[PDB]
Design an enzyme around this catalytic site. Sequence first.
Site, PDB file in Angstrom:
ATOM      1  N   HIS A  83       0.860  -1.156   0.000  1.00  0.00           N
ATOM      2  CA  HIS A  83       0.000   0.000   0.000  1.00  0.00           C
ATOM      3  C   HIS A  83       0.911   1.224   0.000  1.00  0.00           C
ATOM      4  CE1 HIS A  83       0.416  -0.565   4.409  1.00  0.00           C
ATOM      5  NE2 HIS A  83       0.128   0.711   4.539  1.00  0.00           N
ATOM      6  N   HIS A  85       1.664   3.757   2.070  1.00  0.00           N
ATOM      7  CA  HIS A  85       2.328   4.356   3.191  1.00  0.00           C
ATOM      8  C   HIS A  85       3.856   4.161   3.138  1.00  0.00           C
ATOM      9  CE1 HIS A  85      -1.547   4.369   5.809  1.00  0.00           C
ATOM     10  NE2 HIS A  85      -1.433   5.467   5.093  1.00  0.00           N
ATOM     11  N   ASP A  87       6.139   2.906   5.126  1.00  0.00           N
ATOM     12  CA  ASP A  87       6.733   1.663   5.508  1.00  0.00           C
ATOM     13  C   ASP A  87       6.626   0.575   4.432  1.00  0.00           C
ATOM     14  OD1 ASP A  87       4.027   1.830   6.263  1.00  0.00           O
ATOM     15  OD2 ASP A  87       4.274   0.286   7.694  1.00  0.00           O
ATOM     16  N   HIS A 148      -6.895  -1.473   6.467  1.00  0.00           N
ATOM     17  CA  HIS A 148      -5.918  -0.565   6.957  1.00  0.00           C
ATOM     18  C   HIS A 148      -5.779   0.661   6.014  1.00  0.00           C
ATOM     19  CE1 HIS A 148      -2.126   0.892   8.559  1.00  0.00           C
ATOM     20  NE2 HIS A 148      -1.757   1.030   7.310  1.00  0.00           N
ATOM     21  N   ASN A 179      -2.551   2.837  13.307  1.00  0.00           N
ATOM     22  CA  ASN A 179      -2.666   4.059  12.576  1.00  0.00           C
ATOM     23  C   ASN A 179      -3.892   3.807  11.752  1.00  0.00           C
ATOM     24  OD1 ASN A 179      -2.360   6.326  10.775  1.00  0.00           O
ATOM     25  ND2 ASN A 179      -1.132   5.035   9.389  1.00  0.00           N
TER      26      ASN A 179
HETATM   27  O1  LIG Z   1      -0.436   0.142  11.856  1.00  0.00           O
HETATM   28  C1  LIG Z   1       0.476   0.350  10.971  1.00  0.00           C
HETATM   29  O2  LIG Z   1       0.447  -0.440   9.955  1.00  0.00           O
HETATM   30  C2  LIG Z   1       1.526   1.223  11.137  1.00  0.00           C
HETATM   31  N1  LIG Z   1       2.623   1.296  10.287  1.00  0.00           N
HETATM   32  C3  LIG Z   1       3.611   2.145  10.560  1.00  0.00           C
HETATM   33  S1  LIG Z   1       3.211   2.842  12.094  1.00  0.00           S
HETATM   34  C4  LIG Z   1       1.691   2.013  12.235  1.00  0.00           C
HETATM   35  N2  LIG Z   1       0.855   2.167  13.250  1.00  0.00           N
HETATM   36  S2  LIG Z   1       1.217   3.186  14.548  1.00  0.00           S
HETATM   37  O3  LIG Z   1       1.591   4.588  14.065  1.00  0.00           O
HETATM   38  O4  LIG Z   1      -0.092   3.349  15.264  1.00  0.00           O
HETATM   39  C5  LIG Z   1       2.398   2.606  15.869  1.00  0.00           C
HETATM   40  C6  LIG Z   1       2.223   1.419  16.599  1.00  0.00           C
HETATM   41  C7  LIG Z   1       3.129   1.092  17.615  1.00  0.00           C
HETATM   42  C8  LIG Z   1       4.194   1.946  17.945  1.00  0.00           C
HETATM   43  N3  LIG Z   1       4.378   3.156  17.273  1.00  0.00           N
HETATM   44  C9  LIG Z   1       3.457   3.465  16.227  1.00  0.00           C
HETATM   45 ZN   LIG Z   2      -0.006   1.795   6.370  1.00  0.00          ZN
HETATM   46 ZN   LIG Z   3       2.341  -0.305   8.842  1.00  0.00          ZN
END
Ligand SMILES: O=C(O)c1ncsc1NS(=O)(=O)c1cccnc1
Ligand SMILES: [Zn+2]
Ligand SMILES: [Zn+2]
Length: 231
Positions: A83, A85, A87, A148, A179
Amino acid sequence: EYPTVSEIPVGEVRLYQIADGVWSHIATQSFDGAVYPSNGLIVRDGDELLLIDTAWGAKNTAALLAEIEKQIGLPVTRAVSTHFHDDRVGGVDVLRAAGVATYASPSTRRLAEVEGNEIPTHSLEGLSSSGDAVRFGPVELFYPGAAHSTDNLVVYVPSASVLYGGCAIYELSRTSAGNVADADLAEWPTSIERIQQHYPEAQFVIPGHGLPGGLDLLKHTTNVVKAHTNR
Ligand SMILES: O=C(O)c1ncsc1NS(=O)(=O)c1cccnc1
Ligand SMILES: [Zn+2]
Ligand SMILES: [Zn+2]
Ligand SMILES: [Zn+2]
């Protein structure tokens, strides 16, 4: 033996072999004062490798290639981002400079462009409608619907029964929603049902972040998503 954030300094990457010719890659990023790992996938395709997702940034993604070069020794010829984002697309330009053909759905490419994130070069056709599957060398790609994110793909390795859920699937230790700013909470559980209904046979389920499990991770995600929806 599955690598955790305690074994991995930010900037470094660990590979973990899951089956013949199937690895996860694990990296870490510093986000909001916490340290969080991230998973992607590496799938052998003859004498080359397909990479699923970047290692969450240019420096990590350079280390990922160096770690692949050192530990597997086969060239990465293609990469798919699951996707839009950071990461998942962060480090695409690193991949492109090393000669990797980068791929995403048009939906993902458009959202990446709108977001100002890195844009994979090549377009994956045939994934625009919930429940669409397409073959891509040694994997199947599946669009389950919005979860997501609206564009999220999952990846299945028919030959190892490995399902990589990317960020649409949560690890068991994650008991609260991540997130969700770009998520479709209303459709997420239905999207997971689509994954369940298409891959009832998977044995190894890799979440976007943290520890692999089995198919229970899909129900686990549903439970967490519903709990969050009822907050
Ligand atoms: O949920 C996701 O996929 C995600 N990917 C990169 S951060 C994130 N979720 S987040 O920002 O809520 C998170 C979770 C745990 C620790 N820090 C950030
Ligand atoms: Zn994402
Ligand atoms: Zn993620
Ligand atoms: Zn190309």
